[PDB]
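PROTEIN–LIGAND DATA SHEET

This sheet pairs a single protein chain with one bound small molecule, fe (iii) ion, given as SMILES. Inputs appear in the order they were entered. The predicted three-dimensional arrangement of chain and ligand is reported afterwards as a C-alpha cell string under its own label.
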Amino acid sequence: SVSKANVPKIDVSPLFGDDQAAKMRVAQQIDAASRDTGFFYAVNHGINVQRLSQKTKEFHMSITPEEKWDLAIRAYNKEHQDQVRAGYYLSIPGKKAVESFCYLNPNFTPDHPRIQAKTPTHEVNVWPDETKHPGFQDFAEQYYWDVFGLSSALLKGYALALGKEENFFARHFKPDDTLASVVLIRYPYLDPYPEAAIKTAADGTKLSFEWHEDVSLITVLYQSNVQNLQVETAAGYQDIEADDTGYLINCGSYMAHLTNNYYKAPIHRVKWVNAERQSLPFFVNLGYDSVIDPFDPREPNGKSDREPLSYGDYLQNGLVSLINKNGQT
Ligand SMILES: [Fe+3]
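PREDICTION REPORTED AS:
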C-alpha cells in the first residue's frame, strides 16, 4: 500500500479580510504546510467549484473534432503559429488520452502593449463559436478573475508566512499584466485504454504524467473527486487525497528560487486512473518583467547566493523544459 500524504485543510477566508492576527495564524499554517509535504487544501475559498466543474464538463463533452482543429495550438496545427500557449491541446486516440484547453489573461487583447510588441508568452485567447458554446467564454473569463482573486489572497498568506509584508508577491500579480493561465484538462474514461498513453514509473506505478516541479510561483488547482496525485517525500511517494470542494495549493519552482529552497517546489506526479475526470489548474505567474530579489528566511541577514530572475525568462524557458522532459500535453 501507499501511505497518505499530509495535506492539511486551511481555512483561507481570513486572507480576504482585515483581521491581521487571524491572517498571521493562516500564514503559520501555510508555512507549516510548505515546509512539510508542500501541499495544502484551501477551504472556505468562496469559489463555486460545482459550477466550474459543470460548465467545464459541458464544454469538454460538446466540443467537436472540427472545433478542436480550429482552436488548436501550434504543436497540433502548423497554421496557428501564434498559439504557443492558448488554445486546444488534442488527444490522439490509441496513443494519448489527455486533452485540454488553455487560456490566458483576458486583458491580452490585440491592443495590449505586450501583444503589440509580440513579447513571448503573451497571446490573445482563442474561443469556440459562441452559438455552439453559449455562455462559455463569459463564464471562463469570469472564472479567471474569481481564481485570480483567490490567488491574490493566498499570495498575501505566503508573503506573511515568509516574514514579509502582505503585498510582497501580490504587488507583482496584477490584472493588466499577469502571465497566469487556466488549463481545463479532460482525463477521459477509455475502454480499452491504450497502453501507449500510460507511462510506468521506476517503482512500477502506472502514470498519466511523470514527476516534475511546477513552472509557477504557486499553483491553485481544482480536481474532480478521483484520487490521482502523488507527492515525493523523504518517505517516498505518498498519495494526495482528493477533495472536490477545495483547491489544492503548492509552490512552483519560482517560489523555490526566491526563498533559496526554504519553500521547495514539491516533486509530484499524476497516477493513471481509468476514470472520467477533470484537472483545472490555475498557474499563478507574475508579469513578464517582474523580478523578486531572492532571499533566505533561514539566514540571520536573509541574504541568498542566488541571482534575480525575471519572471518572463523563467516562464518561457520553464514551459519549454517541461515539454522536453514530460512530453507535449
Ligand atoms: Fe504539477
